Each structure stands twice: as structure tokens, then as C-alpha cells.
Amino acid sequence: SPEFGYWITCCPTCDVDINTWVPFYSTELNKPAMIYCSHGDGHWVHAQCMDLEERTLIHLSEGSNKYYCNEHVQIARA
């Protein structure tokens, strides 16, 4: 069944675990940074699991551009 929150398994290779996580980005303290993928009905993924550099993540958060996770980015939005 499937799960909401910061401790989900965001993708097939998700490295974020509530039992092992530590801060990575300078904006993180006790929670993993996340970003919304606009594919389909949309879903949330951990920014770190997408291999997003900090500045790419911050610029995305400072704009209205939609983001598409690594899994769905190559899908024809046609």
C-alpha cells in the first residue's frame, strides 16, 4: 500500500531510509529534501535520490518550472 511523507521509497534506487539518513544538502537538518515530480498524477521524490546538485535543487525551488524525476523525465509528454 503506498505511503506518504518524507520516509517513502521514492524510486527503485532510493537511498533514503528513516533508519540511516543523514543531512546532505545545506538546507537539511532532520528531514530529507524533496521535490515534486509532475508526471501523471504527480509524486514526491528525494532530491538526493535524483542526484540533484544543491544549486539545481535550490533554483528549482525558486521558480515555477515543473520537475520530472529520472524515471519519468524521458516520457513523451505529448
Binding site: 538546507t27 537539511e28 524533496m34 521535490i35 515534486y36 532530491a47 535543487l57 528549482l60 525551488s61 515543473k66
Partner: peptide, 8 residues
Amino acid sequence: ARTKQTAA
């Protein structure tokens, strides 16, 4: 894009 924990 909408995000979480990206606030300086």
C-alpha cells in the same frame, strides 16, 4: 517546482 526542506 514544489519542494521540501529547501529553505535556507
